[PDB]
Enzyme design. Structure first.
Site, PDB file in Angstrom:
ATOM      1  N   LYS B  11       0.837  -1.191   0.000  1.00  0.00           N
ATOM      2  CA  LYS B  11       0.000   0.000   0.000  1.00  0.00           C
ATOM      3  C   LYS B  11       0.875   1.245   0.000  1.00  0.00           C
ATOM      4  CE  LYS B  11      -4.347   0.219   0.538  1.00  0.00           C
ATOM      5  NZ  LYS B  11      -5.168  -0.545  -0.464  1.00  0.00           N
ATOM      6  N   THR B  56      -3.320  -5.375   0.235  1.00  0.00           N
ATOM      7  CA  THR B  56      -2.769  -4.059   0.544  1.00  0.00           C
ATOM      8  C   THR B  56      -3.697  -3.298   1.481  1.00  0.00           C
ATOM      9  OG1 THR B  56      -3.672  -2.739  -1.333  1.00  0.00           O
ATOM     10  CG2 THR B  56      -1.703  -4.072  -1.777  1.00  0.00           C
ATOM     11  N   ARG B 178      28.191  33.790  -8.576  1.00  0.00           N
ATOM     12  CA  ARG B 178      26.863  33.457  -9.066  1.00  0.00           C
ATOM     13  C   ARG B 178      26.012  33.027  -7.882  1.00  0.00           C
ATOM     14  NH1 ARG B 178      27.386  27.470 -11.943  1.00  0.00           N
ATOM     15  NH2 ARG B 178      27.999  26.378 -10.009  1.00  0.00           N
ATOM     16  N   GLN B 221      29.052  20.005  -7.685  1.00  0.00           N
ATOM     17  CA  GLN B 221      29.754  18.757  -7.368  1.00  0.00           C
ATOM     18  C   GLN B 221      30.586  18.884  -6.101  1.00  0.00           C
ATOM     19  OE1 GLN B 221      29.333  20.098 -10.330  1.00  0.00           O
ATOM     20  NE2 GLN B 221      29.477  18.618 -12.014  1.00  0.00           N
ATOM     21  N   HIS B 249      18.652  27.494 -11.911  1.00  0.00           N
ATOM     22  CA  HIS B 249      19.401  28.636 -12.418  1.00  0.00           C
ATOM     23  C   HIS B 249      18.671  29.946 -12.138  1.00  0.00           C
ATOM     24  CE1 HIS B 249      21.958  25.697 -14.291  1.00  0.00           C
ATOM     25  NE2 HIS B 249      20.958  25.229 -15.019  1.00  0.00           N
TER      26      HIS B 249
END
Lengths: 300, 300, 300, 300
Positions: B11, B56, B178, B221, B249
């Site tokens: 479920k 379920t 940025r 990263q 972005h």
């Protein structure tokens, strides 16, 4: 003791719309594209040196560029082209996973004939592909998964569920007649890339729907197995098919409090929770290809 | 040649809301629960015999029942309890995967003090667990993943991206400043179940956020690696952590056409596409546990 | 000086699924229903006395009960029935607003013939109605709006936009060829309830699509006006039609940086922002009916 | 007889992110902006002549330009600036409606101190404004609505519902103790624009939350009236407040089938349907301003 493990990166959800207009009868390709590169990107993580990294912005640019230079016919071929392109451009990459969703459009009907350049979304599921390309030259290997998502289907009878294991916590009554309603998500793996992608996709879609409708269901498990095995029987070029199906419960409403009967007619279509029934049907005689499925449906 | 392969069922998305009210100062537990059983369910698929299958619907009932009988403190303990319960009740099951999301609530502030029974959602990410229990008796093995999803965070400086590989398709300019904005999704694996779940969760969450904010980023990263390795260093009971982060972005808008400058001030927050940066940080000295990750994030 | 103003209450999003199964060829009605009552509910707000208030739970029950007792054919007629029913049962009510969405289903194709009881969602927009009933006996007045939502359509040519007001902040170039893509939301008002609902709905839908496709577009404004006025010309029983259309921008990607041209072929399908163009086409010679539109699309 | 009626157009969902960085302690303004102009745009619809029409692309540019030229402090003031700007630039316009949502951010906590430039979304509802400006010079009129959306709040006791109108279709039992859970959507109208926007917003928010928590609830109707009237009493500058509140049902699960009791502890959090309770609290002694509400929440 602490090191970088598995990793991948790329541009997700590049929406590209390609028009074929060499004649006044336009055709459209409406895609959502994901790129992910794997390879030697350890320093980019550990020290911050990005020398090996092709920007995800460039990966997006490449999708639009190749949409023109190579064109977009079958999404499987576009994904294979993108994977090989990135391996040419990114020496540190060992592999590329390209995933694509296609949204189908029909021509608007004008007095019985489809219009040259006016379209309406078909809205009956998403065609998908997941293509993995690894290596170069004689060492190159490729794998193609294709599939369907959000295919919303239901049967109003021909569905039973009885004879199940009963627990001290079981309240569900056995039944020989119920609604079986789902939104099918499925992917299948091709044994090679020598495939007529459009022909096989259309055939697989028809088999899935025909089996769902015509197989008398004793469980969603058994419906899915019948669907998947029918696909494998008709398509020896398909190695395996995975199916994930919610059981979207339509509850027979008790109308006795209102002085009425309800012989399978009035239902409450419940959102959550839902059964979730997931099954794989496989060719036992062919090797597995775990490389094809790595990070499908996602990384973590 | 055609056979049933991997399969699981249960479920999905059982929304259970538990109130602790032994005193007038109520506490709440707001959960979304998934159950999935694995085991010998072959006939239920191939022939339609449901004798092995616990419905379920019963799995949903069990969530509500154990919410009372066992209570809901740490979601990891609730998930472990559910897994062992299903293995007791379903002899054909070999394993159970229980996944839980928790939505946090704060007390409504009334004149400087939190109210006894009035609450407001905290809205700063979802705490998660994925618990897998396999086998019984001396053969039982259990694995706990915990995590955070939809943790929306951003830094407006302290983010660079330069020195990357440049392609004939690269238009992106290098930059030393940025915005770096993401919605963090992460899961980590515990080496044992002898863990103070709440204490460790709170510590891991704080480490992730502190490292994101204070680590000068040369790439998403490298931010992710710094976040993950800090977690492993502070928590030797954690074997590995996987992080999946979109790069949402925020584009510096060109205001020169309007007679204005834009020194890092006005941005367009773009929806799609987005970079998707995914990385695993692992203890090299401990064994892997693929059993813990099977069908995470999903089956296919 | 402080008083209760306008107010309404009821049950929102009652998902009712009705099956017609008097023969083996089943038919389906898949509805989402909102009820809202207006009337003398002041004390229920100001003093807490609920004597006048019919529970929203009962309003939900009524949807299911009348789905059996009265049936569900045209949603306009079901909405009218519900509104009159609530006025009979709730003496304090002065009016009822019943809103319904219908999700269409097709039969699954089995070797060229639609299946008796297996269905697939059509997926091409939602048919809607908003029915307001006020008063009782000779004083009863009713109004019906019907409509279409989420009808996703696009032209790949036959759309221009030039000659517009220029301004110091304008960067958009005039054009004689672009994509025009939208998701149409529209509602129209009927002059009376003596209408063949299904026949008129199908005709209005065809007119909207035909005009969108065949009218050379100098602006979305002009396209919407041509669509709406064509509906009114063909249907003297319709008093007015309102259209709300996003301009979902498909941007021609600059491929010059990649050494390629792009003669209207490769586009980026942007999510946000989007133009939002909204227009009413009306019969100048008939009275307005603001009662029909009150709290459409919502209360605040 | 067929003519163009009411109409408006502009750019919807302009996502602008403004950073204030004159010192190392950055501040953020994260906005979603809608513009809609009204005026003499008839020929643009009927003949296709766009001479009067300022492109929605230019309206988007204007948001970004003025985010720098004028700055973004209170969203009410930015919306007023935008509306006056469009009236100056578009002679055919008679009015402008500017709607803004703001998403709040907190500083990431770094060992007890908020970070200079690292942020986490607050996640507790959206602050909104709807500003309408009509006319120029001495004839200029402006109206400001401000509000809160998606404020998710719940009481676990202090809520009753009894003494309601009974009816043959009622199955709901009267109760003196239940959960009351909602997601508040509200807008209030200011009598003038001589308002400390931030101070009044914070005060109104606190009053709404305090009244929800501390008022013993005999109905959601009565809770909303107590919330709204408390706001008007504390803020004579507010003319009226509209509240729209779903009753998100948390159903007490029957655990008797499992051998357990459930003294208000274990609940099923149902998605749909939900009660929808909507109420206006108004100053009887001030004039209405329907101009402020036109096309709120939408056009049709």
């Amino acid at each position: 003791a602490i090191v970088l493990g598995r990793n991948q990166y790329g541009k997700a959800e590049v929406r590209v719309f390609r028009v074929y207009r060499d004649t006044p009868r336009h055709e459209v390709r409406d895609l959502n594209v994901w790129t992910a590169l794997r390879g030697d990107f350890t320093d980019a993580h550990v020290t911050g040196d990005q020398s090996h990294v092709l920007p995800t912005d460039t990966q997006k640019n490449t999708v639009y560029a190749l949409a023109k230079k190579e064109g977009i016919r079958a999404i499987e071929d576009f994904a294979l082209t993108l994977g090989d392109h990135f391996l040419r451009q990114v020496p540190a990459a060992t592999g590329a996973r390209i995933a694509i969703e296609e949204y189908a459009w029909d021509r608007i009907d004008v007095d019985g004939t489809g219009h040259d350049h006016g379209f309406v979304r078909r809205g009956q599921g998403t065609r998908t592909t997941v293509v993995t390309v690894e290596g170069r030259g004689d060492e190159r290997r490729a794998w193609v998964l294709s599939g369907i998502s959000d295919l919303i289907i239901a049967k109003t009878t021909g569905s039973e569920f009885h004879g199940f294991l009963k627990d001290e916590y079981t309240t569900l009554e056995e039944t020989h007649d119920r609604i079986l309603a789902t939104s099918l998500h499925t992917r299948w793996r091709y044994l090679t890339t020598d495939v007529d992608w459009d022909k096989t996709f259309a055939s697989v879609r028809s088999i899935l729907l025909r089996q769902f409708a015509t197989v008398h269901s004793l469980a969603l498990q058994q419906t899915l197995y019948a669907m998947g095995s029918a696909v494998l029987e008709a398509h020896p070029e398909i190695a395996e098919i995975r199916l994930s199906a919610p059981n979207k419960h339509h509850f027979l409403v008790d109308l006795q409090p209102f002085g009425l009967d309800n012989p399978g007619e009035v239902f409450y279509a419940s959102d959550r929770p839902y059964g979730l029934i997931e099954a794989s049907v496989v060719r036992d005689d062919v090797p597995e290809a775990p490389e094809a499925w790595l990070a499908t449906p996602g990384f973590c």
